Design a protein around this motif. Sequence first.
Motif, PDB file in Angstrom:
ATOM      1  N   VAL A 165      10.223 -35.992  12.407  1.00  0.00           N
ATOM      2  CA  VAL A 165      10.729 -34.632  12.093  1.00  0.00           C
ATOM      3  C   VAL A 165      11.313 -34.516  10.570  1.00  0.00           C
ATOM      4  CG1 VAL A 165      12.120 -32.608  12.512  1.00  0.00           C
ATOM      5  CG2 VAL A 165      10.646 -33.859  14.093  1.00  0.00           C
ATOM      6  N   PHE A 166      11.095 -33.706   9.860  1.00  0.00           N
ATOM      7  CA  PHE A 166      11.620 -33.276   8.662  1.00  0.00           C
ATOM      8  C   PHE A 166      12.697 -32.303   8.795  1.00  0.00           C
ATOM      9  CE2 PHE A 166       8.082 -35.712   6.845  1.00  0.00           C
ATOM     10  CZ  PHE A 166       8.715 -36.884   6.423  1.00  0.00           C
ATOM     11  N   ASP A 167      12.199 -31.026   9.078  1.00  0.00           N
ATOM     12  CA  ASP A 167      12.981 -29.771   9.377  1.00  0.00           C
ATOM     13  C   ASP A 167      12.185 -28.986  10.467  1.00  0.00           C
ATOM     14  OD1 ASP A 167      14.812 -28.081   9.147  1.00  0.00           O
ATOM     15  OD2 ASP A 167      14.245 -27.144   7.244  1.00  0.00           O
ATOM     16  N   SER A 168      12.898 -28.017  11.230  1.00  0.00           N
ATOM     17  CA  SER A 168      12.410 -27.207  12.152  1.00  0.00           C
ATOM     18  C   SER A 168      13.188 -26.057  12.232  1.00  0.00           C
ATOM     19  CB  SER A 168      12.397 -28.123  13.573  1.00  0.00           C
ATOM     20  OG  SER A 168      12.020 -27.181  14.703  1.00  0.00           O
ATOM     21  N   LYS A 169      12.579 -25.044  12.048  1.00  0.00           N
ATOM     22  CA  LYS A 169      12.988 -23.493  12.207  1.00  0.00           C
ATOM     23  C   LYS A 169      13.590 -23.140  13.562  1.00  0.00           C
ATOM     24  CE  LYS A 169      13.270 -21.443   8.261  1.00  0.00           C
ATOM     25  NZ  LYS A 169      14.775 -20.495   7.868  1.00  0.00           N
ATOM     26  N   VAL A 170      12.722 -23.505  14.719  1.00  0.00           N
ATOM     27  CA  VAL A 170      12.905 -23.341  16.076  1.00  0.00           C
ATOM     28  C   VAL A 170      13.903 -24.680  16.386  1.00  0.00           C
ATOM     29  CG1 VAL A 170      12.090 -22.601  18.296  1.00  0.00           C
ATOM     30  CG2 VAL A 170      10.896 -21.850  16.185  1.00  0.00           C
ATOM     31  N   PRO A 171      14.692 -24.667  17.296  1.00  0.00           N
ATOM     32  CA  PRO A 171      15.465 -25.716  17.831  1.00  0.00           C
ATOM     33  C   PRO A 171      14.452 -26.880  18.555  1.00  0.00           C
ATOM     34  CG  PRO A 171      16.968 -23.983  17.977  1.00  0.00           C
ATOM     35  CD  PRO A 171      15.573 -23.334  17.678  1.00  0.00           C
ATOM     36  N   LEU A 172      14.565 -27.966  18.423  1.00  0.00           N
ATOM     37  CA  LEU A 172      13.583 -28.802  19.247  1.00  0.00           C
ATOM     38  C   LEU A 172      13.747 -28.617  20.520  1.00  0.00           C
ATOM     39  CD1 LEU A 172      13.237 -31.865  17.035  1.00  0.00           C
ATOM     40  CD2 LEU A 172      11.629 -30.212  17.391  1.00  0.00           C
ATOM     41  N   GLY A 173      14.901 -28.345  20.955  1.00  0.00           N
ATOM     42  CA  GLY A 173      15.323 -28.423  22.543  1.00  0.00           C
ATOM     43  C   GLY A 173      14.751 -27.102  23.081  1.00  0.00           C
ATOM     44  N   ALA A 174      14.749 -25.992  22.548  1.00  0.00           N
ATOM     45  CA  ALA A 174      14.158 -24.657  23.217  1.00  0.00           C
ATOM     46  C   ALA A 174      12.600 -24.495  22.919  1.00  0.00           C
ATOM     47  CB  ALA A 174      15.173 -23.475  22.664  1.00  0.00           C
ATOM     48  N   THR A 175      11.929 -25.240  22.327  1.00  0.00           N
ATOM     49  CA  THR A 175      10.611 -24.847  21.957  1.00  0.00           C
ATOM     50  C   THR A 175       9.633 -25.244  23.173  1.00  0.00           C
ATOM     51  OG1 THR A 175       8.860 -25.596  20.514  1.00  0.00           O
ATOM     52  CG2 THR A 175       9.687 -27.413  21.532  1.00  0.00           C
ATOM     53  N   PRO A 176       8.996 -24.256  23.491  1.00  0.00           N
ATOM     54  CA  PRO A 176       7.795 -24.528  24.792  1.00  0.00           C
ATOM     55  C   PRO A 176       7.134 -25.632  25.027  1.00  0.00           C
ATOM     56  CG  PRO A 176       7.538 -22.364  23.523  1.00  0.00           C
ATOM     57  CD  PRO A 176       8.316 -23.089  22.505  1.00  0.00           C
ATOM     58  N   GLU A 177       7.056 -26.678  23.954  1.00  0.00           N
ATOM     59  CA  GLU A 177       6.182 -27.905  24.194  1.00  0.00           C
ATOM     60  C   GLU A 177       7.607 -28.576  24.789  1.00  0.00           C
ATOM     61  OE1 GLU A 177       6.346 -26.025  21.204  1.00  0.00           O
ATOM     62  OE2 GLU A 177       4.057 -25.548  21.222  1.00  0.00           O
ATOM     63  N   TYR A 178       8.771 -28.812  24.372  1.00  0.00           N
ATOM     64  CA  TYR A 178       9.683 -29.649  24.874  1.00  0.00           C
ATOM     65  C   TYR A 178      10.072 -29.260  26.316  1.00  0.00           C
ATOM     66  CZ  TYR A 178      13.870 -32.318  24.983  1.00  0.00           C
ATOM     67  OH  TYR A 178      15.025 -33.202  25.188  1.00  0.00           O
ATOM     68  N   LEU A 179      10.227 -27.682  26.373  1.00  0.00           N
ATOM     69  CA  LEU A 179      10.383 -27.404  27.748  1.00  0.00           C
ATOM     70  C   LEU A 179       9.303 -27.558  28.762  1.00  0.00           C
ATOM     71  CD1 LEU A 179      11.750 -23.504  26.719  1.00  0.00           C
ATOM     72  CD2 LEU A 179      12.949 -25.620  27.333  1.00  0.00           C
ATOM     73  N   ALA A 180       8.173 -27.493  28.481  1.00  0.00           N
ATOM     74  CA  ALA A 180       7.078 -27.983  29.359  1.00  0.00           C
ATOM     75  C   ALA A 180       6.960 -29.511  29.490  1.00  0.00           C
ATOM     76  CB  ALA A 180       5.595 -27.402  28.969  1.00  0.00           C
ATOM     77  N   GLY A 181       7.430 -30.283  28.446  1.00  0.00           N
ATOM     78  CA  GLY A 181       7.142 -31.710  28.483  1.00  0.00           C
ATOM     79  C   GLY A 181       6.397 -32.358  27.854  1.00  0.00           C
ATOM     80  N   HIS A 182       5.937 -31.700  26.835  1.00  0.00           N
ATOM     81  CA  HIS A 182       4.814 -32.046  25.737  1.00  0.00           C
ATOM     82  C   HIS A 182       5.288 -33.437  24.809  1.00  0.00           C
ATOM     83  CE1 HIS A 182       2.351 -28.320  25.817  1.00  0.00           C
ATOM     84  NE2 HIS A 182       1.860 -29.199  26.826  1.00  0.00           N
TER      85      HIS A 182
END
Lengths: 55, 87, 324, 177
Positions: C83-100
């Motif tokens: 990861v270089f930069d992320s506008k959306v927090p990595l914690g709250a993104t739908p992929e991370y929430l679903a476990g991707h």
Amino acid sequence: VRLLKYAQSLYQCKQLKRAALGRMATLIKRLKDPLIYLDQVRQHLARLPDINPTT
Amino acid sequence: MGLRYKKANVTHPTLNVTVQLPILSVKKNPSNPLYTQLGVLTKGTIIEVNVSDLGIVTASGKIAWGRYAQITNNPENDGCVNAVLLV
Amino acid sequence: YTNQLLKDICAYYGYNEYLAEKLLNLFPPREAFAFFEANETPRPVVIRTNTLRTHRRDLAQALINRGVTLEPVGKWSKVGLQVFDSKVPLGATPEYLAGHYILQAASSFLPVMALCPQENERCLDMAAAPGGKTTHMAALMKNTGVIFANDPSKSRAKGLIGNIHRLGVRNTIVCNYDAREFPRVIGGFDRVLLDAPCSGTGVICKDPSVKTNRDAKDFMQLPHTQKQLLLAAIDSCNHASKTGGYIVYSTCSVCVEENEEVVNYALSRRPNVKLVETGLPFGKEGFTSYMGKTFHPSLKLTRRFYPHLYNVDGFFVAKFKKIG
Amino acid sequence: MRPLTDQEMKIVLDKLANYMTDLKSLIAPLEDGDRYVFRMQKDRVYYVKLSIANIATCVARDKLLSLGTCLGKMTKSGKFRLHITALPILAQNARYKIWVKDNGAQPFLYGSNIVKAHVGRWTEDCPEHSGCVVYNMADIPLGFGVTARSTAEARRLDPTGIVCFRQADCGEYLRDE
RNA sequence: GACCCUGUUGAGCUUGACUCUAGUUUGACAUUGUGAAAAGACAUAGGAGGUGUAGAAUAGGUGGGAGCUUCGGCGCCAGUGAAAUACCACUACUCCUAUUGUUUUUUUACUUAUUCAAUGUGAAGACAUUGUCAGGUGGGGAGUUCCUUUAGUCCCUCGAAAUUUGAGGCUAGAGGAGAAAAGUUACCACAGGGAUAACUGGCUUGUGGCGGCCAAGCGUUCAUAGCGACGUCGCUUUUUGGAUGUCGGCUCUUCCUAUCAUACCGAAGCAGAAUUCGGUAAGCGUUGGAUUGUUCACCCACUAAUAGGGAACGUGGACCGUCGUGAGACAGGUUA
């Protein structure tokens, strides 16, 4: 401003305003010496001869 | 949003030095256990503060990072949050 | 002079004198200076895809759509990204929430990559505090087989189980035991994973305490504890199986007392162990002898990872095969 | 270290049949002969294999924490509950499935009840209070719940109305960290 | 309303006795063989070792020893290294080749182990399989009614560690009807009970808080049980210059000044001009545009100037319920 927006009482606003104005007062109190230096440089730069290098 | 404070002004009873240090966590608010659990910062409330910057040396010639500090002002009255370190 | 360099480094960087002496012994002045600059320099953050749920190009496309800047982490790791930069927090993104995916380090890549779990296999992980290693073994084996996970503490244990259920492993039994107690209690696992607790000298960007919070007493007790840990692991391991089973030792310590010495002790104690090529592409040769202490010449295959050579956490690996 | 008793496994299968259909498929023998058998530890029920239970019984009661996949726990009144930990089997053997969009699934993952604008496509012949499983667009199991009403009433009801009573979702996992 | 309490409900945390054992269970052993194919490790005979680092060098290592000296090559010296080199003695391991063999394991084939069919001989086949123990568990069944926290012995045992620590034993300080379900929470939803009818009214403004130093006085008996202003020091706080929800909009009267301008003076490197600060002063007058949900900030246009306010903040839903309880709904009503 946020603290006063979420203030809940008259004494709350009392002490919040007092504290803020105290912060600005202390900031200028530390700024005491630069004001003197800048006043002196202002006075001389006013009483400075004005030549035209081009002419 | 605004009412939280990340760092606290910690005064060390010995060495007579006051430094801004980050707040680690909130441990006990005597006014209300609910306030304790939420993290409310009232007067006299002991929190855990990172003292790595101070560099106090403990027994065995060892350094300490986190120590107790008693918030001793009324942050709602004065937003700046002040604590006395417990050493 | 050596003393002048030691004093200058201690004063300028805040390291303890004894740990600074060990690091100066470990690395030459140029390599030492590079190592200190690296370990004060923050490490990059990587993301591991959940192969059970999704695949790399789809996850990358999703994060690009959501505005996350990504780069594949070398040719070595297909499942990983950086990861270089992320506008959306990595914690709250739908992929991370679903476990991707999961957030981790390349040092978290390396040991399970050294391990080679297969389908319908019995595996052990006596230290999985983040749970990423157990999850990645599950992803490799495609939820086929049995996983046993052992922990000391309820807090990191509940963090572990949260990660496991978020990633849908579905075949792990999570327990709070002693790692030394595990072999006698159950034993007989096809594969075993040990992430031994150490001084943590590898990652002081994550743990700035290790810069000073490491005394000679800790440097003495910790290797003894990991010695008993490898004794437990070699007791657990099975010599003969339909699918070859191997022991994997991984640690996040750079000091030699933690590295190559305990595995030399285990090799000397139990002849049933041999060491095989761990299979890791980038690394450094294991030292044959460091402080008047002869080590078995086979330790050449042993790999080391340094922040200064590679943008990875300081990390140590060892792979063993059991005869009888 | 006990199996379930009569009324306990009666309420368990009551909930599991309200939510699933093929509980024969769940408790049916496998090829090796191993069977999936209900376990319950510390008033909390788990789903494990019989071989797993046999190899785990060697442990003392207090020291063992988790086994297999947690299905739920029974309340003091005796009411049995199924959780997001039991979500995967529920998704595997779901009877009724309701699919939601992303803009509606995000409040669903937060903990908000399902709104009509949230759902993408509908299951047919759904009873008013029957249990259902809530998926996203990618067929990822998001949660489960009891619908507020049937499919036709959902069709003819206002978009802002509540659709399903949101029981449990992915929130529990990151709650504990 | 906040707030307290009650019952139900969730969220929890903890307990749910002790001793055996069923359910179990982990590892080993034997049953268990014959060959063939292999591989590994222990028997040996030999060849070669040796870098993390620096040191000139790829430093096994140990004991003596200062040049046997074939040559002063190098010893010595000297850096540099935990370890220094000449020598002659020592013993450890490996990387191996070979065989001077022993073992172990896997696979294959066959029946000789085991077990089945037949049943008063045949087959599967060394896979299964059974028994032996060393463990662990156990709320199920039976029967009865120690552990927890702390320190020492640094004593004994087991370990580690180039010699000091780690884990137990031991000692002494404090704790303690049983499977049906329970205890308990400044917590949640629900229903209910209790309590306050509601706020301020010599209130409001311009100067922060925390800790230390100093500090006249007072004090338990005295500046030390101690309280204690103004200042100063440390943190905020330093080495290069947008916030705003319903509102408003206009006009008019009156009043206050905490005065934007007009008038008057005091001070300022105030040469002049243009100004800044201060005060006496309410007679006088005190306009727009942008922008916006909309206001101010900022921005720009006139203009002597576009100052702030007061005028009782001046005049023109909640239950009766019904259908749901892991969450709600109702064209239902009673209606104020």
